Design a protein around this ligand. Sequence first.
Ligand SMILES: [Ca+2]
Ligand SMILES: [Ca+2]
Ligand SMILES: [Zn+2]
Length: 160
Amino acid sequence: AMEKFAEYALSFGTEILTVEYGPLPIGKIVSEEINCSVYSVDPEGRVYTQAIAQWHDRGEQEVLEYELEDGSVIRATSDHRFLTTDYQLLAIEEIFARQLDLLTLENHRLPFPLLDAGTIKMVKVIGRRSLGVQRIFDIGLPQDHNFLLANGAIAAACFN
Ligand SMILES: [Ca+2]
Ligand SMILES: [Ca+2]
Ligand SMILES: [Zn+2]
């Protein structure tokens, strides 16, 4: 029984897919407290949008750059959780260690069923390297605790 999650964080350059501005580095969003909407998935698999509720500058620390099978990367703390194809939110290091698949997403269109729209891909983490100390951040959302990155990966949001 998990007491709580680690206070994971994303590196400055990690781009979040915003509705109003498209891909934007989380560092910019937080540093400038940019009000915009992100895409998230609910417990029943519906993809929908929600406005950011909290902007947290987490300071700095050692971060790793994980490389995905399609060449994209995730720059974050090793314990940052992401959605897998089994629909579990697990640390990126676990996904790497166990070679699990990240569940990624490659008129009115929203909200829509995750499995019946958008190009769904099953992407493994093929490696990682250290980027040294970088500025880190996270954002809090008013509803579900996850949001889509520009590379399609679904990241866990702040639980505070
Ligand atoms: Ca694959
Ligand atoms: Ca892509
Ligand atoms: Zn936070």
